[PDB]
mmCIF file of C-alpha atoms and ligand atoms in Angstrom:
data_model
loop_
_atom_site.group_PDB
_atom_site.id
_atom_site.type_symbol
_atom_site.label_atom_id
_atom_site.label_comp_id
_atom_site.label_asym_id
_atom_site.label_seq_id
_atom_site.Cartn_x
_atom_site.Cartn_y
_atom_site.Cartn_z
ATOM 1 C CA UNK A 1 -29.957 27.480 153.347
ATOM 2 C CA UNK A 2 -28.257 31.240 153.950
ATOM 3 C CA UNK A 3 -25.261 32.151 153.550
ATOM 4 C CA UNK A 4 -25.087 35.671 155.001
ATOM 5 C CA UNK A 5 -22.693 38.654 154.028
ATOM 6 C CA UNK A 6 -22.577 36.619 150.854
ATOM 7 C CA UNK A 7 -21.399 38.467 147.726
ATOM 8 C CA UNK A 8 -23.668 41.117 146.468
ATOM 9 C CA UNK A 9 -24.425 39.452 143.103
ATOM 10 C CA UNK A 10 -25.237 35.620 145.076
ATOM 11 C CA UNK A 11 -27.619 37.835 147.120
ATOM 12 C CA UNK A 12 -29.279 38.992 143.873
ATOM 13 C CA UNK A 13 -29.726 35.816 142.441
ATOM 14 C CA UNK A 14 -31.633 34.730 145.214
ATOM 15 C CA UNK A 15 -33.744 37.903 145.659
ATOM 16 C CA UNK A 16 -36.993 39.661 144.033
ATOM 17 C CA UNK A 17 -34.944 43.105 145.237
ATOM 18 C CA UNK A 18 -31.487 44.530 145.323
ATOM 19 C CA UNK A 19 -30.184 45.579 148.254
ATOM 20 C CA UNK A 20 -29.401 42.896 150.168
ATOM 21 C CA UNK A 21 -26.671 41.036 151.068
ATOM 22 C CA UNK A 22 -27.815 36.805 152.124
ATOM 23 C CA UNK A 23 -27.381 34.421 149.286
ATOM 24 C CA UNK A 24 -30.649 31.984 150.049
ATOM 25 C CA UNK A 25 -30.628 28.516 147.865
ATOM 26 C CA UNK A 26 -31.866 24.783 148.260
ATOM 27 C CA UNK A 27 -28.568 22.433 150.277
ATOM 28 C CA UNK A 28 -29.011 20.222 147.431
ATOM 29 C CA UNK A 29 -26.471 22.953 145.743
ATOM 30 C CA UNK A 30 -25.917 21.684 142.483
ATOM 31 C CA UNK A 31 -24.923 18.142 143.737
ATOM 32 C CA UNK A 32 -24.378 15.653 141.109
ATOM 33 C CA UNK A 33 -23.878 18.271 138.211
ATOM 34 C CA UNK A 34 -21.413 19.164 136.605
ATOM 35 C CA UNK A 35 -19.998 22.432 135.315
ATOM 36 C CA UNK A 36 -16.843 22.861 132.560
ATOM 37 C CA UNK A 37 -15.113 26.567 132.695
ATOM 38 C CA UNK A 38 -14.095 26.578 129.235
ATOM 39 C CA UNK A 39 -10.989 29.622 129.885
ATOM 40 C CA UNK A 40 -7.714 30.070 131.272
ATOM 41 C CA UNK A 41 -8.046 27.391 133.697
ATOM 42 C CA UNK A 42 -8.949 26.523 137.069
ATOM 43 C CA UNK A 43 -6.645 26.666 140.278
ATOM 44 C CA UNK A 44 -8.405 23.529 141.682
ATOM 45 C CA UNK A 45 -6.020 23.480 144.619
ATOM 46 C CA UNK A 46 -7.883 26.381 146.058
ATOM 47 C CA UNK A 47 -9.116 25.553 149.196
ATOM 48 C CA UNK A 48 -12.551 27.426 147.940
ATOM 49 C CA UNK A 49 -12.867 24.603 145.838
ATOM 50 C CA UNK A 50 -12.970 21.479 148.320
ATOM 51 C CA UNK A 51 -11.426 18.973 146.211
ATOM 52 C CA UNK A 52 -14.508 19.499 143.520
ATOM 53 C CA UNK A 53 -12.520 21.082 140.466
ATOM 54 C CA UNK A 54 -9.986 19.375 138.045
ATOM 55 C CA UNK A 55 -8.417 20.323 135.338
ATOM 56 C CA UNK A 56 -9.225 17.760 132.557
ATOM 57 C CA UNK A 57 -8.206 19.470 129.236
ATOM 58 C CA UNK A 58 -5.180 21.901 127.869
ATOM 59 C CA UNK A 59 -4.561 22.765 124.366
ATOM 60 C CA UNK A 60 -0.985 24.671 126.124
ATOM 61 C CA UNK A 61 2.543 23.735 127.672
ATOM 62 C CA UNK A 62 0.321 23.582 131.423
ATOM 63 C CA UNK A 63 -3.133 22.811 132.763
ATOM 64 C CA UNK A 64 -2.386 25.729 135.249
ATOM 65 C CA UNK A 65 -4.197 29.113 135.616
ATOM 66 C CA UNK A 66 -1.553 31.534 135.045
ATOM 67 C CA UNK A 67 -3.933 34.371 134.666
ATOM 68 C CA UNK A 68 -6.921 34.369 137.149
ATOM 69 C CA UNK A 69 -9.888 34.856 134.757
ATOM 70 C CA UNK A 70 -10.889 31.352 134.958
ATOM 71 C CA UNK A 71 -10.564 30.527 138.495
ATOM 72 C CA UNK A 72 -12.860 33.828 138.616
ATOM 73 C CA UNK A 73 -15.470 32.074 136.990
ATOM 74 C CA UNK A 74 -15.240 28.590 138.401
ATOM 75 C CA UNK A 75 -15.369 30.138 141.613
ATOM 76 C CA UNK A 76 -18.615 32.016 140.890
ATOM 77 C CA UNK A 77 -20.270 28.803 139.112
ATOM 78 C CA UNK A 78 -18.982 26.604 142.381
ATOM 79 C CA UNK A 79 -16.680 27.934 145.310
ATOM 80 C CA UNK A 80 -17.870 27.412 148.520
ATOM 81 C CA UNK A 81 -18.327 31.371 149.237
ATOM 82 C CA UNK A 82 -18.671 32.696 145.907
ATOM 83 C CA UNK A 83 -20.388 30.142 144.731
ATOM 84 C CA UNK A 84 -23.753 29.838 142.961
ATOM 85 C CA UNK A 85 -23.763 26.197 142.953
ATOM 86 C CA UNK A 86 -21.612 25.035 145.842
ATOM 87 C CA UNK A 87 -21.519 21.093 145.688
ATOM 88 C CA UNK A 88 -20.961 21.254 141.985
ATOM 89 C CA UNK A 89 -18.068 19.477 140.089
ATOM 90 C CA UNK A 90 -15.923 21.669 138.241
ATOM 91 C CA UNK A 91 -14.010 20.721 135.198
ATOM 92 C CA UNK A 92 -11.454 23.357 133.435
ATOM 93 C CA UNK A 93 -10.583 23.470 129.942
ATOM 94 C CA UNK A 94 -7.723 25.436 129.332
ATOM 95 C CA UNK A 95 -8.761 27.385 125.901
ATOM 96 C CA UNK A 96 -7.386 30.544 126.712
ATOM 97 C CA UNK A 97 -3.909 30.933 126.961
ATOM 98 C CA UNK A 98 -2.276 32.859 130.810
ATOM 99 C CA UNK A 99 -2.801 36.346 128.468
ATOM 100 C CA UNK A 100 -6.423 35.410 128.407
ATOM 101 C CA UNK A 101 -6.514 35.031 124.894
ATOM 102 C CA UNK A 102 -7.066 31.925 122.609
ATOM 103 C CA UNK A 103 -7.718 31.151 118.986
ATOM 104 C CA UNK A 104 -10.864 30.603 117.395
ATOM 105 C CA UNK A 105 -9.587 27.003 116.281
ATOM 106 C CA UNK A 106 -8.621 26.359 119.684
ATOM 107 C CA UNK A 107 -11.785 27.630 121.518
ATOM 108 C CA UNK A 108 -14.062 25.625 118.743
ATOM 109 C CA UNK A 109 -11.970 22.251 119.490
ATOM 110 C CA UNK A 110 -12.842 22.671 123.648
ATOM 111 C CA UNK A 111 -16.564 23.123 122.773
ATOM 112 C CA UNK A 112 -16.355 19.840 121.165
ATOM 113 C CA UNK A 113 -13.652 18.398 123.587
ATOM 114 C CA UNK A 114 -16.589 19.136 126.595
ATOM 115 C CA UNK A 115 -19.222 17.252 124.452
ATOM 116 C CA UNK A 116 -17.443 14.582 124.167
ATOM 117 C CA UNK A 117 -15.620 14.399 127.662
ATOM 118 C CA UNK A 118 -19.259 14.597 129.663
ATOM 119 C CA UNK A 119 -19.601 11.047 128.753
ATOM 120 C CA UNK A 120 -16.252 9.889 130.589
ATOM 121 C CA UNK A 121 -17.895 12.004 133.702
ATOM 122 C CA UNK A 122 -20.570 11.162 136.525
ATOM 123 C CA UNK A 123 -23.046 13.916 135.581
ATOM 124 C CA UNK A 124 -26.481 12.200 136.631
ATOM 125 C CA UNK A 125 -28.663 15.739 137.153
ATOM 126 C CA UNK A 126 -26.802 17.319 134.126
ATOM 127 C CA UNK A 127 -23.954 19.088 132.399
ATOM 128 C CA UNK A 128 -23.694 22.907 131.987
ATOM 129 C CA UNK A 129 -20.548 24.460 129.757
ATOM 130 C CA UNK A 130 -19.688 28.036 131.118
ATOM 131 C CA UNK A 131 -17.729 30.446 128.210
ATOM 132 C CA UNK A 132 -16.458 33.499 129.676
ATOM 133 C CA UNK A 133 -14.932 34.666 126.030
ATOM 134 C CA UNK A 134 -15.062 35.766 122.410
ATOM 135 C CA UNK A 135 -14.933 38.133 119.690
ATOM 136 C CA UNK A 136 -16.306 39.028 116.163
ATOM 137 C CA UNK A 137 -18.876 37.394 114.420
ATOM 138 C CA UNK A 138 -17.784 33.505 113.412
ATOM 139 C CA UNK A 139 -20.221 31.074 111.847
ATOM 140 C CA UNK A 140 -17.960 28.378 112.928
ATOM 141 C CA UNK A 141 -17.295 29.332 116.358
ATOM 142 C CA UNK A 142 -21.105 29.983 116.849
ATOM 143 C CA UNK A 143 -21.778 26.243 115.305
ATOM 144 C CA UNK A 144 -19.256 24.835 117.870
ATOM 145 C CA UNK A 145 -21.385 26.449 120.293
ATOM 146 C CA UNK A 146 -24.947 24.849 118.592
ATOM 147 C CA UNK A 147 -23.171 21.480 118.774
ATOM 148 C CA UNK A 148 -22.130 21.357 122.479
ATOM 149 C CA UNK A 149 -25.396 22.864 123.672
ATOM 150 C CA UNK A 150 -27.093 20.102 120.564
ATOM 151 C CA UNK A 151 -24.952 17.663 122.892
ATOM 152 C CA UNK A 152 -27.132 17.586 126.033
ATOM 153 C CA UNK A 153 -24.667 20.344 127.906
ATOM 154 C CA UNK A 154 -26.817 23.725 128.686
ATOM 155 C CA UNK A 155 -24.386 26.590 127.520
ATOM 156 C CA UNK A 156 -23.659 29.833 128.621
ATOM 157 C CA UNK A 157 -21.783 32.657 126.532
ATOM 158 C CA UNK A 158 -21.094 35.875 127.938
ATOM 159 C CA UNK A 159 -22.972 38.621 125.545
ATOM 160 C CA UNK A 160 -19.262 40.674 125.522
ATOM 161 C CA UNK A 161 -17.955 43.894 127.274
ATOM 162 C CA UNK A 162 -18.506 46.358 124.175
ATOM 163 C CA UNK A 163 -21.533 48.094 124.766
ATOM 164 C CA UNK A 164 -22.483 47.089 121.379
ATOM 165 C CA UNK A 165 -25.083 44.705 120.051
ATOM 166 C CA UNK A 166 -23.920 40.983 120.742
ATOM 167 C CA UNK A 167 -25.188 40.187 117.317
ATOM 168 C CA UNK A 168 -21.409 41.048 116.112
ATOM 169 C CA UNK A 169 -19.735 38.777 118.571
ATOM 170 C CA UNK A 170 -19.294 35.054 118.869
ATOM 171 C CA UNK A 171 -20.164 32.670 120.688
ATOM 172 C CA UNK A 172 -22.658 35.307 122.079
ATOM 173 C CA UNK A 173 -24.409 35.452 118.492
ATOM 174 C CA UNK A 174 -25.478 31.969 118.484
ATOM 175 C CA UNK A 175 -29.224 31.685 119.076
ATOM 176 C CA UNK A 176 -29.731 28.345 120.354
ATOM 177 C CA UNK A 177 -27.207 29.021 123.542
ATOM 178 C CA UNK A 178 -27.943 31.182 126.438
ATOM 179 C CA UNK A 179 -26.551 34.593 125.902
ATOM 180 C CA UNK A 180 -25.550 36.280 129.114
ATOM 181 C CA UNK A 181 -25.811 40.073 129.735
ATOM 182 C CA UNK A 182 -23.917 42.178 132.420
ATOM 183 C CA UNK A 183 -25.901 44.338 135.453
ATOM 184 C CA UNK A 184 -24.763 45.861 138.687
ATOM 185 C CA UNK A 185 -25.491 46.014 142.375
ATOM 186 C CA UNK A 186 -28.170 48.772 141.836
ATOM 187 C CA UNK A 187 -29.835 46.554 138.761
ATOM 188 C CA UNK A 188 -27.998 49.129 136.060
ATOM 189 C CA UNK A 189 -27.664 47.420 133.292
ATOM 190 C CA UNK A 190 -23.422 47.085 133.400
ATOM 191 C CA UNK A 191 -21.645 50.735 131.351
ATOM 192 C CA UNK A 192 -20.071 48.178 129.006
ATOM 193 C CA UNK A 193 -22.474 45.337 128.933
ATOM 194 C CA UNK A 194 -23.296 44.513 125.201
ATOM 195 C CA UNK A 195 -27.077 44.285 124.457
ATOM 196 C CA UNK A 196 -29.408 42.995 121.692
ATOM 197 C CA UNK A 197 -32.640 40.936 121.043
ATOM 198 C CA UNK A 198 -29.654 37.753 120.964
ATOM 199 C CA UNK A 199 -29.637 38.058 125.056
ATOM 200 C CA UNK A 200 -31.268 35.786 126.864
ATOM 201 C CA UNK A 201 -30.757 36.672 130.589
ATOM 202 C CA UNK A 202 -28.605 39.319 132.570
ATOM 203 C CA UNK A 203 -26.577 38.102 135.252
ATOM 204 C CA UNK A 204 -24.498 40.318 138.337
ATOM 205 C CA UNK A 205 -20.947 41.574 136.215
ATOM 206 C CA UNK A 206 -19.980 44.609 137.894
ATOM 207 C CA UNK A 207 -18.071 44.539 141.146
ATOM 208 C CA UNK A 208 -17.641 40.661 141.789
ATOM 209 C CA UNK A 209 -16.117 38.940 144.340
ATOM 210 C CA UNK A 210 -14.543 35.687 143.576
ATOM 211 C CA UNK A 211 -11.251 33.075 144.032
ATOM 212 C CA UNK A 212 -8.093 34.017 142.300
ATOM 213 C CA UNK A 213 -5.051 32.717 141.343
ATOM 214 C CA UNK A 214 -2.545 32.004 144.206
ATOM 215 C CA UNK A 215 -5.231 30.903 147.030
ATOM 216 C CA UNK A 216 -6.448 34.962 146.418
ATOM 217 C CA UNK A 217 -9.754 36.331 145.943
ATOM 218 C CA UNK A 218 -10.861 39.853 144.434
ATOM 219 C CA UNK A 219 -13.833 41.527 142.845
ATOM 220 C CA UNK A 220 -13.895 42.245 138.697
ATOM 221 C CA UNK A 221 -15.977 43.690 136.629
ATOM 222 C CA UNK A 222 -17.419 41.871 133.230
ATOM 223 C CA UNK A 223 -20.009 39.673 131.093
ATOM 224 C CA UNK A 224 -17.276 36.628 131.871
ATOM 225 C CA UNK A 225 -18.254 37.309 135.317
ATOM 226 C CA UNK A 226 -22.399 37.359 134.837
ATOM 227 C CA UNK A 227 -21.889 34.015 132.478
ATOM 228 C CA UNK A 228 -21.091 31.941 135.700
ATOM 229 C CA UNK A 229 -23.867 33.008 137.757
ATOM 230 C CA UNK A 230 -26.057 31.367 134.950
ATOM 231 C CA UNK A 231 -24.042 28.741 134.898
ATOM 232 C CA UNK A 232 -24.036 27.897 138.129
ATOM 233 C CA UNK A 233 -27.642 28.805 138.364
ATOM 234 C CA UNK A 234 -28.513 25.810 135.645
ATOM 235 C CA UNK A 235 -26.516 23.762 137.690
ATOM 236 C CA UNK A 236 -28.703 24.185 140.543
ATOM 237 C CA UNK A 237 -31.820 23.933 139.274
ATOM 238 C CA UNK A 238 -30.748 20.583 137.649
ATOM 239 C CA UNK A 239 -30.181 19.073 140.644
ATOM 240 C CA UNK A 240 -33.243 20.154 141.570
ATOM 241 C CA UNK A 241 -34.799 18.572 138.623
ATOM 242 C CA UNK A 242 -36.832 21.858 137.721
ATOM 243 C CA UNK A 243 -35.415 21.703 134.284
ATOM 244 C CA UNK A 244 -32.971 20.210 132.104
ATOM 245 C CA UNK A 245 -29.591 21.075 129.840
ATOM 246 C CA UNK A 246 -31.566 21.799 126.634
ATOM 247 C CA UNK A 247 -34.214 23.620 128.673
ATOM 248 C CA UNK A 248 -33.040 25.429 131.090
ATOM 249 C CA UNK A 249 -32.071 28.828 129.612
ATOM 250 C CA UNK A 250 -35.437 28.909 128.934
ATOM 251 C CA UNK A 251 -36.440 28.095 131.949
ATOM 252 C CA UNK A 252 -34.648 30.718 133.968
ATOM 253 C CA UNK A 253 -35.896 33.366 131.418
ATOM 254 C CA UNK A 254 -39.582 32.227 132.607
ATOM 255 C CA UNK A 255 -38.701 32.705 136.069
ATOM 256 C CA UNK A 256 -36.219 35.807 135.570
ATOM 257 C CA UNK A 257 -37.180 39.127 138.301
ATOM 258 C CA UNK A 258 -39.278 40.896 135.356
ATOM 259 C CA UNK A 259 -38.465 44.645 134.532
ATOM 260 C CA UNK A 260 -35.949 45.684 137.318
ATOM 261 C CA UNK A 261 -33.265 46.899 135.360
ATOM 262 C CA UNK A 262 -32.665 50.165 133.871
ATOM 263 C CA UNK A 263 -30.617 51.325 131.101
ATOM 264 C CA UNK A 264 -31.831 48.315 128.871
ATOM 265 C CA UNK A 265 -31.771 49.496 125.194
ATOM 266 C CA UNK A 266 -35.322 49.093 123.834
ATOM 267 C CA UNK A 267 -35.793 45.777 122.138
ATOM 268 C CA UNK A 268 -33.223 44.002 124.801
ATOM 269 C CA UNK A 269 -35.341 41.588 127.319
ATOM 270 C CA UNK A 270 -35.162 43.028 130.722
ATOM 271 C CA UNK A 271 -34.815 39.790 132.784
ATOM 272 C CA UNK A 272 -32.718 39.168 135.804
ATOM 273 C CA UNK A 273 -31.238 35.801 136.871
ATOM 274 C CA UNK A 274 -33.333 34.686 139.983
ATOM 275 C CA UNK A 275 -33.107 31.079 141.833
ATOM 276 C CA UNK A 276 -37.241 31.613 142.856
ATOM 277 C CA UNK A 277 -35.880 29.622 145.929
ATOM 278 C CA UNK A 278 -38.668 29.742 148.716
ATOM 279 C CA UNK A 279 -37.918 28.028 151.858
HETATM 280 CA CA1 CA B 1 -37.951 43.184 141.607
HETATM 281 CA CA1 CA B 2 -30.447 32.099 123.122
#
Protein backbone atom coordinates (compact mmCIF):
# COMPACT_ATOMS: atom_id res chain seq x y z
CA UNK A 1 0.00 0.00 0.00
CA UNK A 2 0.99 4.03 -0.43
CA UNK A 3 -0.10 6.52 1.17
CA UNK A 4 1.26 9.57 -0.67
CA UNK A 5 2.10 13.16 0.73
CA UNK A 6 2.32 11.12 3.90
CA UNK A 7 4.26 12.71 6.78
CA UNK A 8 7.91 13.09 6.25
CA UNK A 9 8.98 10.75 9.09
CA UNK A 10 6.15 7.68 7.76
CA UNK A 11 8.00 8.24 4.43
CA UNK A 12 11.32 7.51 6.19
CA UNK A 13 10.32 4.56 7.82
CA UNK A 14 9.48 3.03 4.74
CA UNK A 15 12.53 4.21 2.73
CA UNK A 16 16.41 3.23 2.22
CA UNK A 17 16.69 7.34 1.51
CA UNK A 18 15.40 10.60 2.81
CA UNK A 19 13.82 12.73 0.73
CA UNK A 20 10.74 11.52 -0.01
CA UNK A 21 7.47 11.96 0.89
CA UNK A 22 5.05 8.22 0.26
CA UNK A 23 4.68 6.17 3.36
CA UNK A 24 4.82 2.41 1.61
CA UNK A 25 3.72 -0.60 4.17
CA UNK A 26 1.98 -4.14 3.96
CA UNK A 27 -2.49 -3.52 4.27
CA UNK A 28 -2.20 -5.98 6.93
CA UNK A 29 -1.25 -2.62 9.06
CA UNK A 30 -0.79 -3.81 12.36
CA UNK A 31 -4.21 -5.67 12.45
CA UNK A 32 -4.80 -7.69 15.45
CA UNK A 33 -2.08 -5.89 17.66
CA UNK A 34 -2.27 -3.96 20.04
CA UNK A 35 -0.49 -0.82 21.19
CA UNK A 36 -0.83 0.99 24.97
CA UNK A 37 0.33 4.91 24.97
CA UNK A 38 1.39 4.94 28.42
CA UNK A 39 1.05 9.31 28.76
CA UNK A 40 -1.37 11.94 29.06
CA UNK A 41 -4.00 10.13 27.34
CA UNK A 42 -5.62 9.50 24.19
CA UNK A 43 -8.52 11.61 22.53
CA UNK A 44 -10.06 8.38 21.09
CA UNK A 45 -12.99 10.35 19.73
CA UNK A 46 -10.74 11.65 17.04
CA UNK A 47 -12.02 10.80 13.93
CA UNK A 48 -8.13 9.86 12.99
CA UNK A 49 -8.66 7.15 15.19
CA UNK A 50 -11.74 5.14 13.62
CA UNK A 51 -13.22 3.83 16.65
CA UNK A 52 -9.68 1.83 17.37
CA UNK A 53 -8.44 3.73 20.63
CA UNK A 54 -9.88 3.59 24.25
CA UNK A 55 -8.95 4.81 27.14
CA UNK A 56 -8.68 1.86 29.63
CA UNK A 57 -6.64 3.21 32.62
CA UNK A 58 -6.33 6.70 34.77
CA UNK A 59 -4.47 7.13 37.90
CA UNK A 60 -6.35 11.12 37.74
CA UNK A 61 -9.86 12.89 38.29
CA UNK A 62 -10.41 12.05 34.04
CA UNK A 63 -9.41 9.54 31.39
CA UNK A 64 -9.28 12.67 29.06
CA UNK A 65 -6.24 14.18 27.21
CA UNK A 66 -6.10 17.57 28.50
CA UNK A 67 -2.69 18.18 27.13
CA UNK A 68 -2.06 16.75 23.57
CA UNK A 69 1.24 14.85 24.10
CA UNK A 70 -0.41 11.59 24.13
CA UNK A 71 -2.84 11.79 21.42
CA UNK A 72 0.55 12.89 19.57
CA UNK A 73 1.87 9.64 20.05
CA UNK A 74 -1.11 7.38 19.63
CA UNK A 75 -1.64 9.05 16.52
CA UNK A 76 1.88 8.32 15.22
CA UNK A 77 1.77 4.53 16.57
CA UNK A 78 -1.97 4.24 14.82
CA UNK A 79 -3.99 7.21 13.16
CA UNK A 80 -5.15 6.64 9.94
CA UNK A 81 -2.76 9.49 8.34
CA UNK A 82 -0.11 9.70 10.77
CA UNK A 83 -0.06 6.47 11.45
CA UNK A 84 2.69 3.83 11.40
CA UNK A 85 0.45 1.05 12.11
CA UNK A 86 -3.01 2.02 10.90
CA UNK A 87 -5.43 -0.95 11.84
CA UNK A 88 -3.87 -1.14 15.25
CA UNK A 89 -5.83 -1.02 18.60
CA UNK A 90 -4.90 1.66 20.79
CA UNK A 91 -5.18 1.59 24.49
CA UNK A 92 -4.27 4.88 26.72
CA UNK A 93 -3.04 4.89 30.10
CA UNK A 94 -3.29 8.07 31.61
CA UNK A 95 0.23 8.30 33.67
CA UNK A 96 0.94 11.70 33.02
CA UNK A 97 -1.08 14.21 34.40
CA UNK A 98 -2.77 17.38 31.52
CA UNK A 99 0.85 19.29 32.59
CA UNK A 100 2.53 16.31 31.09
CA UNK A 101 4.06 15.34 34.12
CA UNK A 102 3.59 12.23 36.42
CA UNK A 103 5.28 10.59 39.35
CA UNK A 104 7.66 7.93 39.31
CA UNK A 105 5.18 5.79 41.58
CA UNK A 106 2.53 6.50 39.26
CA UNK A 107 4.38 5.82 35.92
CA UNK A 108 5.89 2.38 37.59
CA UNK A 109 2.15 1.25 38.61
CA UNK A 110 0.92 1.76 34.56
CA UNK A 111 3.92 -0.37 33.43
CA UNK A 112 2.55 -3.02 35.54
CA UNK A 113 -1.19 -2.01 35.05
CA UNK A 114 -0.39 -2.74 30.92
CA UNK A 115 1.11 -6.20 31.86
CA UNK A 116 -1.50 -7.17 33.48
CA UNK A 117 -4.44 -5.56 31.40
CA UNK A 118 -3.04 -7.32 27.90
CA UNK A 119 -4.59 -10.40 29.21
CA UNK A 120 -8.26 -8.86 29.47
CA UNK A 121 -7.45 -7.73 25.60
CA UNK A 122 -7.70 -9.54 22.07
CA UNK A 123 -4.01 -9.16 21.15
CA UNK A 124 -3.46 -12.42 18.94
CA UNK A 125 -0.18 -10.99 16.76
CA UNK A 126 1.12 -9.17 19.93
CA UNK A 127 1.30 -6.35 22.43
CA UNK A 128 3.70 -3.35 22.17
CA UNK A 129 3.81 -0.60 25.28
CA UNK A 130 4.83 2.90 23.84
CA UNK A 131 6.53 5.44 26.80
CA UNK A 132 6.92 8.81 25.56
CA UNK A 133 8.48 10.01 29.18
CA UNK A 134 11.00 10.12 32.00
CA UNK A 135 13.71 11.52 33.93
CA UNK A 136 16.82 10.72 36.11
CA UNK A 137 18.25 7.57 36.69
CA UNK A 138 15.66 5.11 38.83
CA UNK A 139 16.42 1.46 39.48
CA UNK A 140 12.83 1.01 40.16
CA UNK A 141 11.34 2.76 37.36
CA UNK A 142 13.85 0.97 34.98
CA UNK A 143 12.70 -2.57 36.71
CA UNK A 144 9.03 -1.62 36.00
CA UNK A 145 10.16 -1.29 32.59
CA UNK A 146 12.20 -5.03 32.65
CA UNK A 147 8.93 -6.45 34.00
CA UNK A 148 6.41 -5.24 31.35
CA UNK A 149 8.77 -5.92 28.47
CA UNK A 150 9.62 -9.63 30.85
CA UNK A 151 5.66 -9.74 30.36
CA UNK A 152 5.43 -10.60 26.65
CA UNK A 153 4.70 -6.63 25.69
CA UNK A 154 7.74 -5.26 23.33
CA UNK A 155 8.58 -1.77 24.94
CA UNK A 156 9.61 1.34 23.72
CA UNK A 157 11.21 4.29 25.86
CA UNK A 158 12.10 7.42 24.36
CA UNK A 159 16.12 7.92 24.97
CA UNK A 160 15.11 11.79 26.37
CA UNK A 161 15.45 15.37 24.87
CA UNK A 162 18.82 16.35 26.78
CA UNK A 163 21.47 15.88 24.48
CA UNK A 164 23.08 13.93 27.12
CA UNK A 165 23.86 10.26 27.47
CA UNK A 166 20.50 8.27 28.16
CA UNK A 167 22.46 6.27 30.64
CA UNK A 168 21.25 9.07 33.32
CA UNK A 169 17.61 8.82 32.46
CA UNK A 170 14.89 6.31 33.14
CA UNK A 171 13.07 4.28 31.63
CA UNK A 172 15.56 4.98 28.73
CA UNK A 173 18.47 3.36 30.93
CA UNK A 174 16.98 0.04 31.10
CA UNK A 175 18.83 -2.41 28.85
CA UNK A 176 16.45 -5.04 28.16
CA UNK A 177 13.76 -2.39 26.52
CA UNK A 178 14.14 -0.69 23.27
CA UNK A 179 15.66 2.68 23.73
CA UNK A 180 14.52 5.16 21.13
CA UNK A 181 16.73 7.99 19.74
CA UNK A 182 15.56 11.25 17.94
CA UNK A 183 16.64 12.19 13.98
CA UNK A 184 15.31 14.63 11.46
CA UNK A 185 14.06 14.95 7.92
CA UNK A 186 17.68 15.28 6.56
CA UNK A 187 18.83 12.01 8.83
CA UNK A 188 20.60 14.64 11.52
CA UNK A 189 20.69 13.06 14.38
CA UNK A 190 17.81 15.47 16.39
CA UNK A 191 19.97 18.99 18.28
CA UNK A 192 18.56 17.61 21.54
CA UNK A 193 18.32 13.94 21.00
CA UNK A 194 20.13 12.14 23.96
CA UNK A 195 22.68 9.47 22.83
CA UNK A 196 24.67 6.55 24.33
CA UNK A 197 25.70 2.85 23.73
CA UNK A 198 21.93 2.27 25.85
CA UNK A 199 20.12 3.24 22.30
CA UNK A 200 18.84 0.81 20.41
CA UNK A 201 17.26 2.47 17.30
CA UNK A 202 16.60 6.17 16.12
CA UNK A 203 13.29 6.99 15.04
CA UNK A 204 11.88 10.52 12.96
CA UNK A 205 11.50 13.32 16.24
CA UNK A 206 11.97 16.53 14.68
CA UNK A 207 9.16 18.24 12.82
CA UNK A 208 6.19 15.67 13.23
CA UNK A 209 2.94 15.76 12.12
CA UNK A 210 0.33 14.14 14.16
CA UNK A 211 -3.54 14.28 15.86
CA UNK A 212 -4.06 16.66 18.67
CA UNK A 213 -6.27 17.40 21.20
CA UNK A 214 -9.65 18.93 20.10
CA UNK A 215 -10.05 16.92 16.61
CA UNK A 216 -6.49 19.14 15.75
CA UNK A 217 -3.38 18.03 14.31
CA UNK A 218 0.22 19.76 14.38
CA UNK A 219 3.86 18.89 13.99
CA UNK A 220 6.36 18.67 17.37
CA UNK A 221 9.55 18.10 17.86
CA UNK A 222 10.96 15.22 20.43
CA UNK A 223 12.24 11.55 21.44
CA UNK A 224 8.29 11.07 22.68
CA UNK A 225 7.64 11.59 19.13
CA UNK A 226 10.46 8.96 17.54
CA UNK A 227 9.23 6.31 20.45
CA UNK A 228 5.88 5.80 18.48
CA UNK A 229 7.25 5.25 15.18
CA UNK A 230 8.95 2.13 16.85
CA UNK A 231 6.11 1.38 18.38
CA UNK A 232 4.01 1.32 15.78
CA UNK A 233 6.68 -0.20 13.67
CA UNK A 234 6.69 -3.50 16.16
CA UNK A 235 3.20 -3.45 15.77
CA UNK A 236 3.42 -3.99 12.20
CA UNK A 237 5.80 -6.35 11.83
CA UNK A 238 3.86 -8.52 14.39
CA UNK A 239 1.12 -8.79 12.39
CA UNK A 240 3.22 -9.71 9.92
CA UNK A 241 4.64 -12.41 12.00
CA UNK A 242 8.36 -11.34 11.16
CA UNK A 243 9.07 -11.18 14.81
CA UNK A 244 7.70 -11.18 18.14
CA UNK A 245 7.25 -8.81 21.53
CA UNK A 246 10.48 -10.06 23.18
CA UNK A 247 12.24 -9.96 19.82
CA UNK A 248 11.46 -7.43 17.96
CA UNK A 249 13.69 -4.50 19.03
CA UNK A 250 16.14 -6.65 17.98
CA UNK A 251 14.79 -7.37 15.07
CA UNK A 252 14.33 -3.89 13.70
CA UNK A 253 17.98 -3.11 14.76
CA UNK A 254 18.97 -6.07 12.20
CA UNK A 255 17.03 -4.54 9.57
CA UNK A 256 17.67 -0.72 10.58
CA UNK A 257 18.98 1.69 7.14
CA UNK A 258 22.80 1.21 8.31
CA UNK A 259 25.03 4.42 8.67
CA UNK A 260 22.76 7.28 7.30
CA UNK A 261 22.81 9.53 10.02
CA UNK A 262 25.19 12.13 10.95
CA UNK A 263 25.99 13.80 14.08
CA UNK A 264 25.96 10.35 15.99
CA UNK A 265 28.44 10.64 18.93
CA UNK A 266 31.05 7.88 18.47
CA UNK A 267 30.11 4.76 20.34
CA UNK A 268 26.13 5.48 19.64
CA UNK A 269 24.72 2.77 16.94
CA UNK A 270 23.84 4.58 13.83
CA UNK A 271 20.62 2.70 12.87
CA UNK A 272 17.47 4.07 11.41
CA UNK A 273 13.96 2.62 11.86
CA UNK A 274 13.05 1.01 8.41
CA UNK A 275 9.77 -1.26 7.64
CA UNK A 276 12.15 -3.26 4.67
CA UNK A 277 8.59 -3.38 3.09
CA UNK A 278 9.02 -4.53 -0.66
CA UNK A 279 5.97 -4.81 -2.65
CA1 LIG B 1 20.36 4.88 3.15
CA1 LIG C 1 17.87 -2.14 24.72
Amino acid sequence: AAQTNAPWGLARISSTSPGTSTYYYDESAGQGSCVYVIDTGIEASHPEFEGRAQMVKTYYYSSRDGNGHGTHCAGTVGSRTYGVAKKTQLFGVKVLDDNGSGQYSTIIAGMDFVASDKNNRNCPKGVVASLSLGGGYSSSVNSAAARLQSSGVMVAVAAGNNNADARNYSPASEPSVCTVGASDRYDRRSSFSNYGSVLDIFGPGTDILSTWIGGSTRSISGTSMATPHVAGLAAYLMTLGKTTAASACRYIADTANKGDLSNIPFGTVNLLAYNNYQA
